[PDB]
C-alpha cells in the first residue's frame, strides 16, 4: 500500500548479492521492491526532523527612525562632527551643501555637513543552522498483501515509523511475522549540511545554502544579539535625500519582505513551526532482506467461489490493483491468482502481492499486478473456474523502455550520482559509472553552476553550434555531450 497513486515510483526488481539492495528515496517519491522471494515492501519517506539548531544571523526587513540630529561646520575649515555619531546604533553620513551670508556665517563656500539617526528594527529573520547531527529521518515501510481500506491512507499503523539518525545506524526494523528487516542509511551523504541554512521569516521558512545567505545584503547582525542593536550595514537600508542645495534628509527604506520573497524563489522552502518540519531532501539507504518470511507457507489453495468487489484500477502503467472478497469456508488459504494469455496457456503476467493470502475471512483483500502490453486474461478462479476478467493494457513495449529511459534521465538529473547508486550491485560497471560521473559531472555540471533557465539553454545551443563547426572529430566531445547535458538539463531543472 501507501505507494499507490503517488505516480513517480521506483520499481526495484530482484536483490541478489545474497542480501542487499540500494535504495535512494525522497519525500514526494516512494519505492516498491521485489525479489524472487520475500514479501514486496514499500519504502515511503516522511518528515525529516533536525532537533537542535543554532542561530546565525539577524536580518531585519523593516525599521524606523527618530531623534536624528545633524550638523555642519561651514564651508572650508573642519569636517563637521556630532556627539551621537559616537554610538553606532545611530546611522551617520557626511554630505556637502554650501553656506554663506544667507546661511549667515563665513566665507561663502560649499560646506561639509553630517547627520545621524537612531535605528530600530521590528521584524527579523531568525536564520539558524544545524550541524550534521541532531537530525533524523522517519520512514514508513509498508507491506502489501491485503488488509483492507487503502493502498493509500499513509495514516494508520502498518510499516511503523522506523526512525533513524546518523548517531545510530543499521536501522533494525520489525513487522508482524516476516517483518525482520535491516536498513542502513548514509545521512552524512545527504543534503550536505554546514552548507545549509534554515531561515524562519514571520512564519514561513526557507532552506538555502550558506554562502549566498552570508553575502545577502540588508542590515547585518550577529547571532549573539543580546540588546546589541548593533546592526552593521544600513547603508543599503535607509537612503538619504539631498535635494538641490540646502540641507539633507534621512528616509526609512521601507519593508523589502516581498522582494525578499522574489529573492528566495529558486529555493525550496520549508515550513518550520515546532523545532523543525523539514521536508524534501533525499536519502540513501541500503537494504539487507535476509531475515524475511514469505508471510505464510504450506497452506491449501483457497477452496473456490470468490466474489469480487470493484474493478480494475490501472494506475501509471501496470500495477492494476483489484479488490476481492472471498466467500466460503477454507480459512486463510492461498488465493490462486493468475494472469494468462488467450486460452492455450502461455501464461504470463507478473504478480505483485507476492503470495496473496486470505485473512480472517470476511475482509476486502486486494492485489496488484502487471499485465503485458496487450490483451490480458486474468483468472482468480479454480474448481468451477469461478472467475475470469477480460483486460486490455494499451501502450506497448518500446514506449515503456522509452519512458523508463526518461525516468532514469530525470534521476540522473535531480539526484546525482547517488542515482547511479540507486540500482543494486552492478559489480564493476555500476561502480565505475558512479565514479566516472562522480568526478566528471562534479567538474562539469558545477563550474558553470549558479546559472538559470535562460543562460543555460542559450549557452547550450551556442556551444553545440561551435561544436558543429569544429574539426578533428572532437565535435562529439563537444556536440553530443554538449547538447545533451545542456538542453536536457535545461528544461528539466528549475522546478
Amino acid at each position, epitope marked *: 500500500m501507501r505507494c499507490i497513486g503517488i505516480s513517480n515510483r521506483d520499481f526495484v526488481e530482484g536483490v541478489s548479492g545474497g542480501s542487499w539492495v540500494d535504495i535512494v528515496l525522497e519525500h514526494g517519491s516512494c519505492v516498491t521492491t521485489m525479489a524472487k522471494n520475500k514479501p514486496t515492501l514499500d519504502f515511503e519517506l516522511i518528515k525529516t526532523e533536525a532537533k*537542535h539548531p543554532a542561530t546565525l544571523r539577524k536580518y531585519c526587513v523593516e525599521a524606523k527612525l527618530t531623534n536624528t540630529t545633524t550638523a555642519s561646520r561651514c564651508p572650508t575649515q573642519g569636517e563637521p562632527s556630532l556627539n551621537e555619531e559616537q554610538d553606532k546604533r545611530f546611522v551617520c553620513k557626511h554630505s556637502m551643501v554650501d553656506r554663506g551670508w544667507g546661511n549667515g556665517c563665513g566665507l561663502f563656500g560649499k560646506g561639509g555637513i553630517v547627520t545621524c539617526a537612531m535605528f530600530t528594527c521590528k521584524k527579523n529573520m531568525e536564520g539558524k543552522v544545524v550541524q550534521p547531527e541532531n537530525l533524523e529521518y522517519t520512514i514508513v515501510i509498508t507491506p502489501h498483501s491485503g488488509e483492507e481500506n487503502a493502498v493509500g491512507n499513509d495514516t494508520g499503523k502498518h510499516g511503523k515509523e522506523i526512525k533513524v539518525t546518523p548517531q545510530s545506524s543499521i536501522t533494525e526494523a520489525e513487522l508482524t511475522g516476516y517483518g525482520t528487516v535491516t536498513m542502513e542509511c548514509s545521512p552524512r551523504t545527504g543534503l550536505d549540511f554546514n552548507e545549509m541554512v534554515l531561515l524562519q521569516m514571520e512564519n514561513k521558512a526557507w532552506l538555502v545554502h550558506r554562502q549566498w545567505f552570508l553575502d545577502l545584503p540588508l542590515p547585518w547582525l550577529p547571532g549573539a544579539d*543580546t*540588546q546589541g542593536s548593533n546592526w552593521i550595514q544600513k547603508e543599503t537600508l535607509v537612503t538619504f535625500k539631498n535635494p538641490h542645495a540646502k540641507k539633507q534628509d534621512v528616509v526609512v527604506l521601507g519593508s523589502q519582505e516581498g522582494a525578499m520573497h522574489t529573492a528566495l524563489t529558486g529555493a525550496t522552502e520549508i515550513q518550520m513551526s515546532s523545532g523543525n518540519l523539514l521536508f524534501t531532501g533525499h536519502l540513501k539507504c541500503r537494504l539487507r532482506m535476509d531475515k524475511l518470511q514469505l508471510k505464510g507457507m504450506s497452506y491449501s489453495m483457497c477452496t473456490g467461489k470468490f466474489k469480487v468487489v470493484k474493478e480494475i484500477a490501472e494506475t501509471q502503467h501496470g500495477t492494476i490493483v483489484i479488490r476481492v472478497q472471498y466467500e466460503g469456508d477454507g480459512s486463510p488459504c492461498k488465493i490462486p491468482f493468475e494472469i494468462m494469455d488467450l486460452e492455450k496457456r502461455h501464461v504470463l503476467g507478473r504478480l505483485i502481492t507476492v503470495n496473496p493470502i486470505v485473512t480472517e475471512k470476511d475482509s476486502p483483500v486486494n492485489i496488484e499486478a502487471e499485465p503485458p502490453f496487450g490483451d490480458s486474461y486474468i483468472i482468480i478462479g479454480v474448481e468451477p473456474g469461478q472467475l475470469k476478467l477480460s483486460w486490455f493494457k494499451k501502450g506497448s513495449s518500446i514506449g515503456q523502455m522509452f519512458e523508463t529511459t526518461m525516468r532514469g534521465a530525470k534521476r540522473m538529473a535531480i539526484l546525482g550520482d547517488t542515482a547511479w547508486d540507486f540500482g543494486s550491485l552492478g559489480g564493476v560497471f555500476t561502480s565505475i559509472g558512479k565514479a566516472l560521473h562522480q568526478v566528471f559531472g562534479a567538474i562539469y555540471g558545477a563550474a558553470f553552476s549558479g546559472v538559470s533557465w535562460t543562460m543555460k539553454i542559450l549557452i547550450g545551443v551556442v556551444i553545440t553550434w561551435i561544436g558543429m563547426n569544429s574539426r578533428s572529430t572532437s565535435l562529439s566531445v563537444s556536440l553530443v555531450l554538449v547538447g545533451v547535458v545542456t538542453l536536457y538539463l535545461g528544461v528539466m531543472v528549475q522546478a
Partner: antibody
Amino acid sequence: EVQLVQSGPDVEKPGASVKVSCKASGYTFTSNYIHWVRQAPGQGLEWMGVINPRGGSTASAQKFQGRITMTRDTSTSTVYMELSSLRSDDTAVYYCARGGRALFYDSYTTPRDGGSWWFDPWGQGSLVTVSS
Amino acid sequence: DIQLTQSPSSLSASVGDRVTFTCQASQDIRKYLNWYQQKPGKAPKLLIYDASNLKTGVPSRFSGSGSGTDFTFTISSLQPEDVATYYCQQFDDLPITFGQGTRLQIK
C-alpha cells in the same frame, strides 16, 4: 569557600535603570560562568542572562532584549547586572551564579553542562522594587 | 520554546511517606534536567543533576528518574525538614528555563 555576596536591596522610579552587583569568592573568578535569574514574588524562577568573567562575552534572554547590560571587574572578581527602563513588573528579587565549564566565551550546551547552576552556590538574592 | 511542565503544583503529605514529582518536556531534553529544593526566604538549593544523580552532602532519600521528555523526582521517606518548594530545570539549548515549582505541606 564557594560564596556570593550581592549588594543590598534597592528601590527605583519607573523608567529608570538599576545596577546590582555580584561578588564571588572561593575559586578562580575566571573559571565559572555567571548567570542572572530573577524571581517575582508571585512567580517562580526566570532566566535573565549570562556573562563570562573571562574575556567579557555575554548573552541575554529575549524577554529582556534591549533592556539589560552585563559587565565585570576582574580585579575585584565581581560582576555587574544592570536593567534599564525599569517598570513595576521588574520588581522582584535577583540572583547570580556560576558554571564549571570550558571557556573562552559564554554559551555552552555540549560541553560538561549543568552542575548546580544556582541551587548550592547561589547568592543570597537581592530585592529591587520599581515604584513611584 | 523548551516548555517545561511540572506536576503536581502542590502536595500535602504525612511524615515518612514517599513522594514523587514529574516534569514533562515539550522537546526531548535527553539527560539534562535538574531538581531543586528551596526553602522560603532561602536561596534555591541543589538536589538532582542529570536527572539521575544525588549531590554529595545530600541525604540518600532523594532520587530522580526519567529520560526523554519525562521525569520523576522521589523522596523515599518524607521528613519534616524537607518542607520546601521543589523545581526541575531544563538546561538544553540554553534558553534556560525552570519548572514552575511544587510546594509541600506536612501532615
